[PDB]
Amino acid sequence: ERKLHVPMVDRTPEDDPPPFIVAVVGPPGTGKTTLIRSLVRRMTKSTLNDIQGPITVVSGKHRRLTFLECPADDLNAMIDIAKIADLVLLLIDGNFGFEMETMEFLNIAQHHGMPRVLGVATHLDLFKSQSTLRASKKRLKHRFWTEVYQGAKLFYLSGVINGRYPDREILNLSRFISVMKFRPLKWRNEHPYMLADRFTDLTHPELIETQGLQIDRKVAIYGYLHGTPLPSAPGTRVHIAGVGDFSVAQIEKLPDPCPTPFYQQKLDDFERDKDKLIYAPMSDVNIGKLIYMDNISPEECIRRWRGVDLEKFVPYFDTFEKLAKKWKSVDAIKERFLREMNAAKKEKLRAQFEIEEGENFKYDTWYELQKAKISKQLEINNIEYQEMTPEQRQRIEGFKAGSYVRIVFEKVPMEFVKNFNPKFPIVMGGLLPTEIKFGIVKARLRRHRWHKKILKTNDPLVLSLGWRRFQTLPIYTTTDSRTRTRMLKYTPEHTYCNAAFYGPLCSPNTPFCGVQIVANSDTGNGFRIAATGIVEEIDVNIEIVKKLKLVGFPYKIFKNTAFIKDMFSSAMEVARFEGAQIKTVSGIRGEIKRALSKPEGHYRAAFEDKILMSDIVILRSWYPVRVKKFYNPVTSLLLKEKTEWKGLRLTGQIRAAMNLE
Amino acid sequence: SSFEKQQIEIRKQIEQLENEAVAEKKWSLKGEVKAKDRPEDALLTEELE
Amino acid sequence: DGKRAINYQILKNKGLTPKRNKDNRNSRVKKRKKYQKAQKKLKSVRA
Amino acid sequence: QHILKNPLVAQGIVDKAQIRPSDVVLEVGPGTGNLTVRILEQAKNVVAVEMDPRMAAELTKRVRGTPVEKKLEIMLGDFMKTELPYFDICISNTPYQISSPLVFKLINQPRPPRVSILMFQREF
Amino acid sequence: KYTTFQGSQNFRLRIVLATLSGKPIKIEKIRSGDLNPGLKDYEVSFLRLIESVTNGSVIEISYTGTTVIYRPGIIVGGASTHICPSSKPVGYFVEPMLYLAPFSKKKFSILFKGITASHNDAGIEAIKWGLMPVMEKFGVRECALHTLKRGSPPLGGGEVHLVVDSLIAQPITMHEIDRPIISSITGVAYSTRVSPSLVNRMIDGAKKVLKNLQCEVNITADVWRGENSGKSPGWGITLVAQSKQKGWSYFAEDIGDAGSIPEELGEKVACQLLEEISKSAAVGRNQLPLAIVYMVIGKEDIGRLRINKEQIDERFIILLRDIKKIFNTEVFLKPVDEADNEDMIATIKGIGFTNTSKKI
Amino acid sequence: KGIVLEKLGIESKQPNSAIRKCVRVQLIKNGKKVTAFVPNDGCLNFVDENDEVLLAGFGRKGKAKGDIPGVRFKVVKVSGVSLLALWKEKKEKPR
Amino acid sequence: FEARQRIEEKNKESSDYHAKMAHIVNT
Amino acid sequence: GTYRKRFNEKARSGHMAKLKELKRIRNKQFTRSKVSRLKKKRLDKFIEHQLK
RNA sequence: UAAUUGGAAUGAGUACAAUGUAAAUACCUUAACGAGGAACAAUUGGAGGGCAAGUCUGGUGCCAGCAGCCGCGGUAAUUCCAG
Ligand SMILES: Nc1nc2c(ncn2[C@@H]2O[C@H](COP(=O)(O)OP(=O)(O)OP(=O)(O)O)[C@@H](O)[C@H]2O)c(=O)[nH]1
Ligand SMILES: [Mg+2]
Numbered sequence A: 001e002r003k004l005h006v007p008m009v010d011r012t013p014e015d016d017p018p019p020f021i022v023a024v025v026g027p028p029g030t031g032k033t034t035l036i037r038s039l040v041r042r043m044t045k046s047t048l049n050d051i052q053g054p055i056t057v058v059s060g061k062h063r064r065l066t067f068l069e070c071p072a073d074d075l076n077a078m079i080d081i082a083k084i085a086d087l088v089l090l091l092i093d094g095n096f097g098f099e100m101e102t103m104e105f106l107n108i109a110q111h112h113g114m115p116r117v118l119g120v121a122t123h124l125d126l127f128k129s130q131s132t133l134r135a136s137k138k139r140l141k142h143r144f145w146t147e148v149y150q151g152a153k154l155f156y157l158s159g160v161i162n163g164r165y166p167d168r169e170i171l172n173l174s175r176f177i178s179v180m181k182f183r184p185l186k187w188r189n190e191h192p193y194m195l196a197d198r199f200t201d202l203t204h205p206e207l208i209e210t211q212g213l214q215i216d217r218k219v220a221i222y223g224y225l226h227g228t229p230l231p232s233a234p235g236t237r238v239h240i241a242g243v244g245d246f247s248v249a250q251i252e253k254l255p256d257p258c259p260t261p262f263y264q265q266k267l268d269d270f271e272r273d274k275d276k277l278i279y280a281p282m283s284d285v286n287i288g289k290l291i292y293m294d295n296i297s298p299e300e301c302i303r304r305w306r307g308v309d310l311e312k313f314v315p316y317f318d319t320f321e322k323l324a325k326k327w328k329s330v331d332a333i334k335e336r337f338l339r340e341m342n343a344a345k346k347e348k349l350r351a352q353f354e355i356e357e358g359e360n361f362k363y364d365t366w367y368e369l370q371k372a373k374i375s376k377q378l379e380i381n382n383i384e385y386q387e388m389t390p391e392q393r394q395r396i397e398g399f400k401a402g403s404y405v406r407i408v409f410e411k412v413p414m415e416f417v418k419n420f421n422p423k424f425p426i427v428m429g430g431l432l433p434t435e436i437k438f439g440i441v442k443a444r445l446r447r448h449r450w451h452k453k454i455l456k457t458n459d460p461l462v463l464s465l466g467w468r469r470f471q472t473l474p475i476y477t478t479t480d481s482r483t484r485t486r487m488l489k490y491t492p493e494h495t496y497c498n499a500a501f502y503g504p505l506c507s508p509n510t511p512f513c514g515v516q517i518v519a520n521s522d523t524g525n526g527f528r529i530a531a532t533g534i535v536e537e538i539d540v541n542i543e544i545v546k547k548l549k550l551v552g553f554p555y556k557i558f559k560n561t562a563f564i565k566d567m568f569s570s571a572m573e574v575a576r577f578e579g580a581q582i583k584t585v586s587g588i589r590g591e592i593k594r595a596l597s598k599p600e601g602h603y604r605a606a607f608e609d610k611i612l613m614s615d616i617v618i619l620r621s622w623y624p625v626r627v628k629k630f631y632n633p634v635t636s637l638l639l640k641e642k643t644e645w646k647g648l649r650l651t652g653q654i655r656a657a658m659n660l661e
Numbered sequence B: 001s002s003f004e005k006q007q008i009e010i011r012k013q014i015e016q017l018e019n020e021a022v023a024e025k026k027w028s029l030k031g032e033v034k035a036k037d038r039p040e041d042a043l044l045t046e047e048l049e
Numbered sequence C: 001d002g003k004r005a006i007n008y009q010i011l012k013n014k015g016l017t018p019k020r021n022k023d024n025r026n027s028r029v030k031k032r033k034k035y036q037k038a039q040k041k042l043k044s045v046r047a
Numbered sequence D: 001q002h003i004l005k006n007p008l009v010a011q012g013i014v015d016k017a018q019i020r021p022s023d024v025v026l027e028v029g030p031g032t033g034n035l036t037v038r039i040l041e042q043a044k045n046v047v048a049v050e051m052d053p054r055m056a057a058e059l060t061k062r063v064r065g066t067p068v069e070k071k072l073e074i075m076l077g078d079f080m081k082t083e084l085p086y087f088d089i090c091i092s093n094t095p096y097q098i099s100s101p102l103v104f105k106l107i108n109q110p111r112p113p114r115v116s117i118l119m120f121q122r123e124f
Numbered sequence E: 001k002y003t004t005f006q007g008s009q010n011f012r013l014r015i016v017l018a019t020l021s022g023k024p025i026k027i028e029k030i031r032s033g034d035l036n037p038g039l040k041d042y043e044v045s046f047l048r049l050i051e052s053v054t055n056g057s058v059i060e061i062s063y064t065g066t067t068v069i070y071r072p073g074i075i076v077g078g079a080s081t082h083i084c085p086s087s088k089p090v091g092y093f094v095e096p097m098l099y100l101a102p103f104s105k106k107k108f109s110i111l112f113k114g115i116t117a118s119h120n121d122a123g124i125e126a127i128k129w130g131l132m133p134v135m136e137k138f139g140v141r142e143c144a145l146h147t148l149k150r151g152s153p154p155l156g157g158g159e160v161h162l163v164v165d166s167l168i169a170q171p172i173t174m175h176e177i178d179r180p181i182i183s184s185i186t187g188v189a190y191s192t193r194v195s196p197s198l199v200n201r202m203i204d205g206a207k208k209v210l211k212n213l214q215c216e217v218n219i220t221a222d223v224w225r226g227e228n229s230g231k232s233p234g235w236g237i238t239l240v241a242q243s244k245q246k247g248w249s250y251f252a253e254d255i256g257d258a259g260s261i262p263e264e265l266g267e268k269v270a271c272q273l274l275e276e277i278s279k280s281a282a283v284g285r286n287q288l289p290l291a292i293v294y295m296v297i298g299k300e301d302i303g304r305l306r307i308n309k310e311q312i313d314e315r316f317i318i319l320l321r322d323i324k325k326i327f328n329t330e331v332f333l334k335p336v337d338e339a340d341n342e343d344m345i346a347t348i349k350g351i352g353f354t355n356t357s358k359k360i
Numbered sequence F: 001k002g003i004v005l006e007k008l009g010i011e012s013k014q015p016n017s018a019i020r021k022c023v024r025v026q027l028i029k030n031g032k033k034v035t036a037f038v039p040n041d042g043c044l045n046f047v048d049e050n051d052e053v054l055l056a057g058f059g060r061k062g063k064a065k066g067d068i069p070g071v072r073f074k075v076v077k078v079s080g081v082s083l084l085a086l087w088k089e090k091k092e093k094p095r
Numbered sequence G: 001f002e003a004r005q006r007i008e009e010k011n012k013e014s015s016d017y018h019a020k021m022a023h024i025v026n027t
Numbered sequence H: 001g002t003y004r005k006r007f008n009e010k011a012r013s014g015h016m017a018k019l020k021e022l023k024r025i026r027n028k029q030f031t032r033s034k035v036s037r038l039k040k041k042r043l044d045k046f047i048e049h050q051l052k
Numbered sequence I: 001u002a003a004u005u006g007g008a009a010u011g012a013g014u015a016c017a018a019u020g021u022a023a024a025u026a027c028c029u030u031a032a033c034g035a036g037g038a039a040c041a042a043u044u045g046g047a048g049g050g051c052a053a054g055u056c057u058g059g060u061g062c063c064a065g066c067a068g069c070c071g072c073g074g075u076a077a078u079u080c081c082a083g
Helices: A033-044 A076-086 A098-114 A131-145 A166-175 A206-208 A261-268 A289-290 A298-306 A320-326 A331-336 A341-356 A369-387 A390-396 A412-420 A570-578 A651-656 B002-022 C027-037 D011-015 D038-043 D053-062 D096-107 E009-022 E041-053 E091-103 E125-137 E197-209 E264-280 E286-295 E315-326 F083-087 G002-024 H011-025 H035-050
Strands: A018-026 A055-058 A062-068 A085-092 A115-120 A195-200 A217-226 A236-242 A244-247 A250-253 A406-411 A427-430 A438-447 A461-465 A467-472 A473-477 A499-505 A512-514 A529-539 A542-556 A561-565 A582-584 A590-595 A603-607 A617-625 D026-029 D045-050 D070-075 D089-092 D115-117 E003-006 E026-027 E058-059 E069-070 E078-083 E108-114 E143-149 E158-164 E185-192 E220-224 E234-243 E248-256 E302-307 E331-335 E344-349 F003-007 F023-027 F034-036 F052-057 F072-079
Touching: A018 A076, A033 A062, A033 A166, A055 A412, A076 A098, A076 A427, A085 A098, A098 A512, A115 A131, A166 D115, A217 A412, A244 A406, A250 A427, A289 A298, A289 E315, A289 E331, A298 E315, A331 E264, A341 H035, A369 E302, A461 A499, A461 A529, A467 A499, A570 A590, A590 E315, A651 B002, D011 D038, D026 D038, D038 D045, D045 D053, D053 D070, D096 D115, E003 E315, E009 E026, E009 E041, E009 E091, E009 E286, E009 E315, E041 E058, E041 E078, E041 E091, E091 E108, E091 E125, E091 E158, E091 E286, E125 E143, E125 E185, E125 E234, E125 E248, E125 E286, E185 E197, E197 E220, E197 E234, E197 E264, E234 E264, E248 E264, E286 E302, E286 E315, E286 E344, F003 F034, F023 F052, F023 F072, F034 F072, F034 G002, F072 F083
Parallel strands: A018 A062, A018 A085, A085 A115, D026 D045, D026 D089, D045 D070, D089 D115, E003 E026, E078 E108, E185 E220
Antiparallel strands: A055 A062, A195 A217, A195 A427, A217 A406, A236 A244, A236 A427, A250 A406, A438 A499, A438 A529, A461 A467, A461 A512, A473 A499, A512 A529, A542 A561, A542 A617, A561 A603, A582 A590, A582 A617, A590 A603, E026 E069, E058 E069, E108 E158, E143 E158, E185 E234, E234 E248, E302 E344, E331 E344, F003 F023, F003 F052, F023 F034, F052 F072
16 A cells, blocks of 8 residues: 555557656756756767757657756746656755755645656865765755655765766766656646747748738747647647747648657668767657538538438438338348257357346456556557558547647747747647636635745735736635635635636646746745645636625613614615614624614614613625736746746835835 | 737736725725715615625 | 845744743753742642 | 334335336335335325225325325225226235235236335245 | 538537537528528527526627527536427427536526427437436436426427436546347337327337337336326327347337327337337437537547448538537548448547536 | 545534544545545645545544544545645645 | 525535435444 | 465466476375356356246 | 843864874864854644634523634734743
């Protein structure tokens, strides 16, 4: 019972799986370019320089690795890469310690689904003594063991003698990330995703010049498809993270430009890459067919294959007498119904036993049973694909993972091309049918335990959900013991309120994660993740109910009967409420009974005890509040700077910048 | 370019929202309200419970 | 620096442990005080 | 005279009978209708046979105002001397001295039933 | 924008599909060449039903009434009623809720009134024994159709009750490559507000047809009378041939009105049933749209269903072209290698579908 | 080990009641589904549906004012981390 | 009408959950 | 534990051949899925039933 | 009971140095630094107590019971069971 698990489905292919993506992350100065430089130098014997963009390198007879130096500062890029990364070389300074970006990325990875995190600690050649060094190594290792599992091994890299790290350690990294098996996550095995090696805009100069350069250009984007079959017809939808939400106009499978030697070996066993081990383009160096022909009427299609409405239920039967003569002798349908001759009886009886009750008779645990059913299904898929002529396989399976693909959009905004730089990742994501609708989501969430200040109702929260980052206006509700949805005005400091907000939908039980400001100017020393949740249900209306108490005074007192002023102002006001409940502030129950007419708002009310004059009456009304409908998607890489996307400002901030209480 | 039109209307929505959000609250989003602080008949046109 | 160094709280990681005295640190000190307190009682009942 | 008090063997007896929504249940010796009302929910028309008009009066009092008030006939007298009408399954609790007559009377019916859930003494 | 369909042909199917996939559609030129163009009354009532079970959706109807613009919302459910207009029986509105029922937030408890028999549309033994077992194969556990009162044409006034209890996330992937062996024949034969010699005479005719084939034959006679029997006489039959091993069914039904010699009617339905059997493999010719749609919305996984080549007809081709217009799903028909007959395995890769409107 | 099959008493009004604290859990070795307690009712937010709870025996020495005959297990670790390390806010649940 | 329908929902749900915990344990 | 169940038996072939011999001798003194059993038994009951 | 403060004491740590050792590292020894919230920030468990202009349940009134991180405002602000 360390072995058993929730069963899940893999959906990585078996013939040519794509390259694994190896993000390399860490703070600004920590040496994450020397790492990628020396890893590639060990794995191809071919030193680079000026590394930018994804970079695919063959490592072995099969593994291909797609390195990606994540940018240092921008919390948007860390969110993107944490969604797609598949190994993380999380590299932390050794002399300094942890730094707050390492912690931030770690929590973003833990919420969306944690990739294989492997930590490496650099700047270890700055220590002056072995006792300081040795204790600090142990201490970072133990904190890192809290964040990731225990026994997770980190690597310690000394100096950068030649623009690159040692050989013993780098050889250990290469061995270890080239034996490693990856975990079947959830979000990645339903959605196709794609990491883009190169990028070209496809318009004439003529439309630019003759229409004044403004128009959203047609753009084609190349790269590797991970995840799930991206279907082989145009028009499917896509979210290009940090840009927007498009629909693909043409797709096409290229021949992939970094083949493993196994692949070339099998390709040269058709006709019967010694230095091109690295591919860094973004840096410089028949009735079944007769059904599906639209221009044919169905009737003519049937006629050719031989040689009407569906609104009626009963099908078309022949005419009565033709049946009556046809089905007199039922011999034709015979086989749908249940010293040597003895064996003939027993063969008849054997087949009958198999039919009749020979179903009730057909591993050790219950996890192995489920995985055996799953894997039986996966090979049924495989077999029924490999009878399909590769065009047809392409038509109904549709560009499985590992395919190199060119896809091309049109009407893509101008800024994406003018403000391009290869260091930021562009990451295509597929979309399920739910995640294109908009609605209100009811999630549950807590202040993130390290965030200093609690949140507030109706202060904007940039949250990431699915492939999307968008800024919304949540509204945090408790529930008054499963009766109503009282509208809280803060986040509880140590537990789970619910929240409701207006955004793109996503399926129930999906974890998300939300921040305050992402702008790299005004960040300071505080932790930045600010809420963690899952989305609980999905709809298009909720009603939230703020508690509002009407407060009034007494002015004439009987025994067990009072006269009330100052709560109301008219007569029909009271006449709307004859039968309400008023409770004394001191605490005895009561109600209101009747209205006085000549006094304008004064009336008479009953009670259980004779009221003291200073007591005050309050009625507990329930006003309804409702969510706003703000939605401000980040689009962080259309700007000129990309490290500051600013949206609504927090209420304290706009009071500070307007100098008011 | 369509991006600038989309953010000009975004800034419209944002500026209106901030101007609302710092501003003083409407009565029916408080507790302990009288007929003093509110205008009259505002419990006949509202449908609380 | 420009380096966003780490907090105290998210270094030593002791969330929600309750707040005890300054005397659960040092057992000798706690037994000392409890002896010289529960010796006062025996100086009233053995009067 | 004994009373099947257990309110959980009663439901199991009923739903093993596989009553269709177009059945005529004979239900011999109904008792105080601890069992009957389930059959009233699941059958089109019930024919209860009874000998104690005290029980018959109370049982027909049980169904009053209930929507199933019109889907229950009662035949009085000795069971082994009536003429049973057509009936389509049969459910029986009746005291055990008729356990051996009953069975053969069902086997020798004209148009016998299709299934019957009978309660008997263990050795029988 | 809008996927755009022509004509009035197979209305209910495109409305149901455009609710399942969640892509707004637009149907145009709806009998616009015809005398009074537009939707008939029952199509408008069907749109009222669809709008009643799906919170969030938006329907518009053109000025004349020959262009419907549908934008689906989520499915919700609830318990409600419906008053089926006089021209169409309740089966017309039961069947699309069979497609749409197991995928909602709350259960279905819908109460239909109206006529409960016709020549063209589905019966009440058709839906019970003809399309609940296909739904039960595809992972739907607890569904039922309580007949309360049975009407008849021309007046009716019956009422039935669709209760659907299990809410699956998505149907299972259903491999079936074998011709089932038929092991029994049951069937119902019913009549309202007539003397009971009719039912016996229908059973006489049917059993005289089926007195030569090697399985058991039984028929539940069902004679309503009085106050829940509706307002107008009529009689009808349904025969189900039932394969017990795997749980498959092939069935043929009809009703009958003033004038029909009921022995001929029973003989007719028995002949039609045999015809249906001889043109079938694992599904009858009319349970096939339900199974094909439940294959399409499965999970992303090849599902194989065997069909006889006689089932390949014009309704099939229309249905598959409508699926390829909404879903973009081709359907690979490979042939079998039994060289005694010309069956075809039909393999459909399911789209990736769930029930995104449940709650956790 | 076990899969959280569903929650029980998630719609039970009376807070901190025992039937509020109990989830219903399928074990992965047998296939048999049982019920399991959970300490500290706030920790029902941590288990969702299809988590891997690692159950331990409840083994209670005594029976209190409003307890339950029938809960026999208790949840120790939810998807790798341990409920004392989520409730004390040391770690947090790796999805 | 609201307060009633809440009472029958609450009674049924509570009783059924206790019945399931009576359905498991002496198996 | 002579005639145990070893983990993998194709890779222990000379061993199991030797054990087969040992068993042959030592018990020549006396020689001188149960779902397949349940399936065979039910089949034979069925055949007997149909002949009767 | 202490809740301010008065100087005396020392090593965890850092370190010239020597010793150690094959070579280092550490121990043992030692110049120079190194203690007031001595923030140079002991833990793991279980038992009680209170928390109302709050919620929820039941009833022979003002009650009881569950519970109470959910109240009228307010979160660079509340400086709260100093905590
Ligand atoms: N002494 C020492 N210097 C290092 C180490 N690692 C990196 N450096 C130096 O620090 C500088 C930063 O290294 P980069 O390769 O720029 O790493 P980076 O994280 O990409 O830095 P940015 O480009 O600013 O993101 C380089 O000039 C290295 O020579 C180390 O372990 N020890
Ligand atoms: Mg760099």
